[PDB]
Symmetry: C3
Subunit: 449 residues, 3 copies
Amino acid sequence: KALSAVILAAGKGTRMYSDLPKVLHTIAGKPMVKHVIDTAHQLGSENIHLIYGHGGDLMRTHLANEQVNWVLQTEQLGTAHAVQQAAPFFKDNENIVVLYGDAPLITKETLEKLIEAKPENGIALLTVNLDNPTGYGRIIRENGNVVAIVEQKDANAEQLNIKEVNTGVMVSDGASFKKWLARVGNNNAQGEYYLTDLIALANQDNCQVVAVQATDVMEVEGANNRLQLAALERYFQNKQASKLLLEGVMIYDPARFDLRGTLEHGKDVEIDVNVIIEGNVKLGDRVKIGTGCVLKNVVIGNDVEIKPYSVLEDSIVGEKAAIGPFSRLRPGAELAAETHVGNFVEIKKSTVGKGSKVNHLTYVGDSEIGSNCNIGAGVITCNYDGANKFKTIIGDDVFVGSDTQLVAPVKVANGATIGAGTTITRDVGENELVITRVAQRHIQGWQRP
Amino acid sequence: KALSAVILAAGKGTRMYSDLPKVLHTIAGKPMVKHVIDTAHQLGSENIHLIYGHGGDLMRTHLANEQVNWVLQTEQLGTAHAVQQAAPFFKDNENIVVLYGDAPLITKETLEKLIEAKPENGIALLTVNLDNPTGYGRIIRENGNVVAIVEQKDANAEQLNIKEVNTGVMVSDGASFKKWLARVGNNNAQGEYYLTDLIALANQDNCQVVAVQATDVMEVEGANNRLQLAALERYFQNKQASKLLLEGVMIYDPARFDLRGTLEHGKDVEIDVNVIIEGNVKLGDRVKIGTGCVLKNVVIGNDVEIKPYSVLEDSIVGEKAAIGPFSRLRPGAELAAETHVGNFVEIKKSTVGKGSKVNHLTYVGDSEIGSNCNIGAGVITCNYDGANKFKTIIGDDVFVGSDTQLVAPVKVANGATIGAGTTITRDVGENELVITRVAQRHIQGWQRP
Amino acid sequence: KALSAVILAAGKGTRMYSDLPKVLHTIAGKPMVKHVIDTAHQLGSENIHLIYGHGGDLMRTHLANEQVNWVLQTEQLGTAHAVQQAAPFFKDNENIVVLYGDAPLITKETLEKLIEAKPENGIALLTVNLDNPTGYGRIIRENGNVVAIVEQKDANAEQLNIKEVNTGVMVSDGASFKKWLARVGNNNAQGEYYLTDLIALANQDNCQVVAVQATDVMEVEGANNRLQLAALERYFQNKQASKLLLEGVMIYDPARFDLRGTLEHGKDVEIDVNVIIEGNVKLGDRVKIGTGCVLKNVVIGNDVEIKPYSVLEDSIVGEKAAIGPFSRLRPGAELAAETHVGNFVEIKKSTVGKGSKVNHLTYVGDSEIGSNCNIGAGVITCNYDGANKFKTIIGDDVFVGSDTQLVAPVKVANGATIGAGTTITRDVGENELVITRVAQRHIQGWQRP
Ligand SMILES: O=C1CCN([C@@H]2O[C@H](COP(=O)(O)O)[C@@H](O)[C@H]2O)C(=O)N1
Ligand SMILES: O=C1CCN([C@@H]2O[C@H](COP(=O)(O)O)[C@@H](O)[C@H]2O)C(=O)N1
Ligand SMILES: O=C1CCN([C@@H]2O[C@H](COP(=O)(O)O)[C@@H](O)[C@H]2O)C(=O)N1
Ligand SMILES: [Mg+2]
Ligand SMILES: [Mg+2]
């Protein structure tokens, strides 16, 4: 049958000490709630009902493009009340899964298992086994079915030893949710309407509740503060790193690797310690990434080595290129095959043709550079004190001597040669040599201090 | 009643294989003994008696400003002998706490609990429970009181199973210390005067010894070598990081964060992996620190982003500034609000006014730069081959073209414009444009190799 | 008696998803098999028989200089078959130890113990105790001798609880190997000739099999994939770091330290977090290495501080030098005592004499620089558009003003002074001052946009 999701996301998250609401804090660069939305989508959810409240404005701005039903809860009166806000939108004959925006690690595979276990007109309850279950509601099984969730304060001595505990994550049909949510009271020490009470109500109705255990305890773990969030982060990164390792990526130390987005990789890729991969990154075969590198939204071709402490964003790098160490590629940097970019070099919104080298102490911006060019140490593209900054066009087989300024807009044609220390303002023709004529004063017998 | 401390700090620390004495090795940038002195002070210690010996010269030079009584022990004849060196200075009716300079993690809270437990004319003994207590003196409790510390070699089979062990940290009144220390012998396999023996002597005198357990085992842990020291370091950093996380600082990975000093922070601060914070650092609200940064003695205003691999020392940065990546701020760097400092830029002992940008491959030293200036790529402040280096003064709304040298002492007035590739030696007036007149040789039909 | 080794190295390593064969994947920069070869050599092995097969070409190119007997196995028919390939080369009266190229952490000390335990005409079997021994062959001891290795599928209930397990690593005499290997069959579910069967055959012959337990479980651990390899890496680095710590090297965090080669060190050396030491590195007394540094094949003298994010290769640095932060030393960089190299500086194949400073935004290549020189910010050595790049020779006590290009081949004699912004093409004489004569256009009342 069909499926829709409810995600509880209304919390203030006081103990985060933040201007953000609780579920917008990021794990691997992505709000916690976004992980849960994505998981709900990948399960095949037809609708995703997002129960929100605190930080409403920020929720709407941060998640504006999410395919969710925005259900604004004016007061937090308990989890059952929250789910009930979405209930008018439940189809009677679809399944509904209830998830929490502050528990981002829940997997599709566990949730498929949960949904699969749900008996007709009944409930599948996600449980977890804890070594110290103190404080949590104990699962009571009779004849394979959950007959009660006994809270800490009610449990007898033997019940307290039960390690299996309620997570609050559950699946039932829309009709059953509508029926049972209407029967939830708030007669308890907290005066709240608890979703937990559906298990009792199902049992009252001679409907079956089946427990499904989460394989990994961390999967169902939520974060109430940034210490807990950091723990989820570490768990998440280690899981990501382990997957890549088993796919054949050499990650020198998986404890010092961060992926904040998606990585596409070839074979024999090597990633040294303290690399951060952000956004959408694609690495070809035999790419080597040295220590300290940051790659954000880049495509790297086969056989590229990126040497240590290089930072790349919104860039493309052709096969057999060599980058770094201490290289900076800014958005729109496009390096062709067999190119060389060296230390203390910055390339912004420029194309660099096959075989060209830019190896030291250089800024190239808003430029086209052709094939087999030699861009000397200290070369700088610049503009007049004007408005909008213009383009520098360098053809093929050009030599630009060290510490030369190229003043845009300017064109240097194929095969041109430019002496060291030159200021280029006028276009340079094909096979034109331009050398600066210096005037020097020479003083003999100048004794230094 | 009053309190004073004795700190045992005389050890050579042979297994550190160092020219330093044992307690001067640092944890979080601070000698181990300094941690203990600070803790003693924060407890309200009136006097702190520092028992020192090996590396006496280095102790005195490294700890010259510490408010301690310098008690020079000419030979190490045991812990009781060490404490006895300070005993003539004990007030009869003050409490004395005995601490060890090679155990820096002991907390004020544990020591307050210890002092609180001390019975009149008796002793409060700090103990710890160990999973493998082999080798350590077993605590024997009879009717809530410590009646004996039974050493490994004396313990019977059931005593050996006791997990509670003596730490040597203890509190008693000054009169009692003076009395009992005089009765300590050295009739044992090591021929040493052990402070441990005070428990027996107290029990001989019908005085009460009460045990107080340390909550955290690591708290009472000492370091005899650099492997053990590294373990204390890691424990200490994790404790610091956890505190910051619970205060609402987002630390992406607390295992890759180091604080070596003090951090003051606002809300919504984010610190990426491999950041080191040294000395006194203050961060405002919504400061973001990218990977690899080092901040030593800096103040950073609200809404500043520091991008990766930036190194800052003895610097001030105004609100909404943007620094990095690959930026270097050296002592005396003062950046106003809304400033921009970019890659491969070094700023030393200079002020940079509101809105100004220094974005590439630049050295600014001993300079004043006003508001809304544009300092081009490759610009360098420099001096004559002289003595003492002089100041470069740049006014407001100045454009300095790329690869220009500013030769101090020189002044560039408001609104001036300087062309690329210029050498500025003479003062530039308000609204003065200075452009270098180049001479070039152009050779047509120059065929490159 | 004499000893030779057999190393099994023929595997494809399918689950590495690599073009390399299994044993060429590196641990600490060295192929797994190379670790094992070195260990075999350090044991005093007379011959080392390398059984290889998959990736034969790559084995031969990657290990071309190894002192091994190359034994090419045309098909993998089991471990006994592999060892039998080398058997014609066994001396009857030498010991043979069998090792696996995919288990690089095995120690000399464990293998000496194993060899020592071997009874005359018998076998010493290396075993390990596992907490979950499921799937592995259980060691059955009767009267101190191994009488059987019972596999998972054959073991009775009590045998399954045995934690001691077969590793496949074993020692016997050459004659005994030749005899028993000829009696190994392949009558089993896998149809393979298992070396394991020698234990049964020895027991058939009334020969003694003695078990020797590995002290460290990880020692005998192999890697079938890159996840397992990463675990071996971490274990290996932690062991290396711990050894250095106990020798008196201050490693701030041993979990963020990598050694890929050999380190020679003096006393009071301090290494901050995220340092990588590669090849052969020698550090003198009181060397301080800041965070993020990479040192490959370098010699560093006493009292040198290398500041953060410096990268050094094939370089020598004299005592009391100061390097970094953001410094790059490329092969052939030789810095004398008391030199200074600063941020965004690159030195390649150059010698720099005592007391000289190169502190900012500079490239020095193919150069000799004498003592007490001052190389200004922005200085660049360069060449003509020619063939082969030539040498720049700078004498003693030379001042080179900022943003000066030195165009090789050129010589600047002792005591010369060069103004800022100069292009040096002609040799500069002793005590010669060279200053560039600039032409400037000054335009008053130029109002900026
Ligand atoms: O009425 C509510 C209750 C709980 N919640 C959210 O559900 C999550 C779990 O609920 P409890 O902390 O009451 O067990 C939590 O993140 C909380 O903020 C709502 O969004 N609305
Ligand atoms: O006479 C002494 C004995 C011990 N000590 C110091 O006290 C600390 C603990 O003493 P023991 O290693 O004997 O248990 C240790 O750091 C040791 O160096 C002295 O300073 N003087
Ligand atoms: O015939 C063989 C069998 C095993 N081996 C190698 O020996 C190692 C251990 O053998 P098993 O995976 O069958 O237990 C493994 O690395 C495998 O590749 C050979 O080189 N040749
Ligand atoms: Mg210049
Ligand atoms: Mg320059």
